[PDB]
Structure 1
Amino acid sequence: MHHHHANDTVVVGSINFTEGIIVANMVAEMIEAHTDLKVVRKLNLGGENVNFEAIKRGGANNGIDIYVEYTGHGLVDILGFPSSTDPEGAYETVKKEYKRKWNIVWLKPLGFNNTYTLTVKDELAKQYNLKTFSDLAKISDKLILGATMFFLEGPDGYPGLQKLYNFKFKHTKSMDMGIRYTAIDNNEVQVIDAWATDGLLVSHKLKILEDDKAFFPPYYAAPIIRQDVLDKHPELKDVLNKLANQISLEEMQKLNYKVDGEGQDPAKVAKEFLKEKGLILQVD
């Protein structure tokens, strides 16, 4: 699964994915509050690999200098390595390899693991004492999965997950857009797929289950930056590392909800979050 549908200038990128826009705007705000660097906020069109192609180009070549990447995307999709089960091993691997291959520096994780998950209504989890994918698999022969199309079409999706856990859902319905949220609300399906930080989980009274057999890789978000930009502006390392461990899963979910559920401006959501925990000053 993919996370998509001194007066010099630094270019911060994201693609059109709510979480990505929010965290990219946070990165921009931190640079604008703590340095005199000019920040271009580039919204790249296309899938998430456009960010990787852009960072290899660099802001000086109509690309970008910084974006927020997930450890497992770098590990599996970019480097082609197997899906590790250890967050630290995954992080150290991408950090070492990105530095060696492309002179790209992984900074510290933001604090959340936006991994792919299966979710059920809180009420179902309470009724059947569900915590893990393995718990769900045991009762899956009574249940229906409503899932995004890409999750059903791929060995890294439900087919592979089904093999590892022996899922036996009666039906697996392809439901794009917001169809599966309405379906689970209506008890037409009993399980949906979602990113762990999906802004709709709390408002739909949904519970994320644990991938106890570790099918999915770690997906810890962290800023990554070109070394040549750090060479010119070494102060960016400490400025951006002020975000280290500053965004929990629950905090990120709430920000995604403000945008996707409440229609708030992601730039305002990002800046207000930083101001409310003192990461920028009240007058910044």
Structure 2
Amino acid sequence: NDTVVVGSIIFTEGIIVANMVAEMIEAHTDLKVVRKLNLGGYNVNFEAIKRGGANNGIDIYVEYTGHGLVDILGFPATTDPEGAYETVKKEYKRKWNIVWLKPLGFNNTYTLTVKDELAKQYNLKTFSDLAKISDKLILGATMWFLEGPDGYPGLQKLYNFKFKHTKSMDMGIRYTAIDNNEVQVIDAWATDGLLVSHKLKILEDDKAFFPPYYAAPIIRQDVLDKHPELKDVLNKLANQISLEEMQKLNYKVDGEGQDPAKVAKEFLKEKGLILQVD
């Protein structure tokens, strides 16, 4: 075949990075790229990569080390980033003939965030710092975070958080709530595109509750067999996206309403990862 299928679920960062992968393939090879950027949740991406692009699936997507380690493989979360990466790389190769390429450079871990003003008022840097004053505070959180021991239940047990109220707030309700001081803490991905524009600060998970969540492209071995050049092409992205860069791209989409495909391609051009005329 001469076509490769890049997938993403419906979420800003995923769509941006999947578009980057597609642009790199289109700029450095003659392969046709099908972008399947509307996959659902519940590990559909993973099921899709096991089918492959030739079987109504996908060939490549960007996965996070801790999700592969804990959710897909069922391994303990408390590990160092390199260990998590090497474990997922070895195990995905052995079990499914899927190849983890090099990390993009950022760790999009889940976190708790506060207004920068509150952080400076109480000198907050870590989750433990927040727990010490949590009895004065209200948490506004997404529904997924409040359900399941991997979210707030386990975090609260580990840190002894004592928030006065924990309010279920989906959509962008919790951002408005924290802006209005109706809540004082919200949950967020570390690369959330609204963190800077809302003057929010991410706190450190000092007890290491959350696993490393380093983004990396993963690809079927049989696609690399047909098109070995893809390895080096996609590894041109290695360590090219820092946390701050990713957050800025997410902001261009979520805060400024820009087209994620344009955001992705313009970032690549600005970094010299594709040519100005590509």
The answer on whether the counterparts of 1:65 and 1:226 sit within 8 Å (CA) in structure 2 is: yes
The answer on whether the counterparts of 1:73 and 1:219 sit within 8 Å (CA) in structure 2 is: yes
Mapped partners of 1:120, 1:201: distance in 2: 9
The answer on whether the counterparts of 1:72 and 1:83 sit within 8 Å (CA) in structure 2 is: yes
The answer on whether the counterparts of 1:44 and 1:50 sit within 8 Å (CA) in structure 2 is: no
Mapped partners of 2:209, 2:198: distance in 1: 25
* Matching residue of 1:67: 61
Identity over aligned pairs, percent: 98
The answer on whether the counterparts of 2:61 and 2:218 sit within 8 Å (CA) in structure 1 is: yes
Mapped partners of 2:249, 2:157: distance in 1: 34
* Matching residue of 2:159: 165
* Matching residue of 1:93: 87
Consecutive unaligned residues of structure 2, counting only runs of 5 or more, are: none
The answer on whether the counterparts of 1:104 and 1:224 sit within 8 Å (CA) in structure 2 is: yes
Deviations along 1:24-65, one digit per CA (max 9) or x if unpaired, are 000000000001111000124310501000000001111100
Mapped partners of 2:251, 2:185: distance in 1: 20
Consecutive unaligned residues of structure 1, counting only runs of 5 or more, are: 1-6
Mapped partners of 2:40, 2:10: distance in 1: 8
TM-score w.r.t. length of structure 1: 0.97
* Matching residue of 2:38: 44
- Which residue, out of 252, 256, 270, partners 1:258? 252
The answer on whether the counterparts of 1:14 and 1:24 sit within 8 Å (CA) in structure 2 is: yes
The answer on whether the counterparts of 2:138 and 2:184 sit within 8 Å (CA) in structure 1 is: yes
Deviations along 1:114-161, one digit per CA (max 9) or x if unpaired, are 000000000000011100001100000111100011111110011100
The answer on whether the counterparts of 2:100 and 2:219 sit within 8 Å (CA) in structure 1 is: yes
Mapped partners of 1:84, 1:232: distance in 2: 37
Mapped partners of 1:187, 1:90: distance in 2: 38
> Which SS does the other structure have where 1:44 is aligned?
strand
Mapped partners of 2:104, 2:245: distance in 1: 11
Total equivalences in the alignment: 278
Mapped partners of 2:2, 2:169: distance in 1: 46
1:82, CA displacement in angstroms? 1.5
Deviations along 1:202-241, one digit per CA (max 9) or x if unpaired, are 0000000000100000000000000000001110000000
TM-score w.r.t. length of structure 2: 0.99
Mapped partners of 2:230, 2:42: distance in 1: 24
1:85, CA displacement in angstroms? 2.6
Map 1:1-284 → 2, pairs under 5 A = 8-47=2-41, 49-284=43-278
> Which SS does the other structure have where 1:67 is aligned?
strand
Mapped partners of 1:36, 1:178: distance in 2: 41
Mapped partners of 1:128, 1:62: distance in 2: 53
The answer on whether the counterparts of 1:122 and 1:205 sit within 8 Å (CA) in structure 2 is: yes
Mapped partners of 1:281, 1:219: distance in 2: 30
1:171, CA displacement in angstroms? 0.6
> Following TM superposition, where does structure 1 have runs of at least 4 consecutive aligned residues deviating by more than 6 angstroms?
none
Mapped partners of 2:240, 2:42: distance in 1: 23
Q: RMSD of the alignment, in Å?
A: 0.8
Mapped partners of 2:130, 2:79: distance in 1: 20
The answer on whether the counterparts of 1:44 and 1:51 sit within 8 Å (CA) in structure 2 is: no
Deviations along 1:141-187, one digit per CA (max 9) or x if unpaired, are 11110001111111001110001101000110111111100010011
Mapped partners of 2:73, 2:38: distance in 1: 21
Mapped partners of 2:9, 2:167: distance in 1: 28
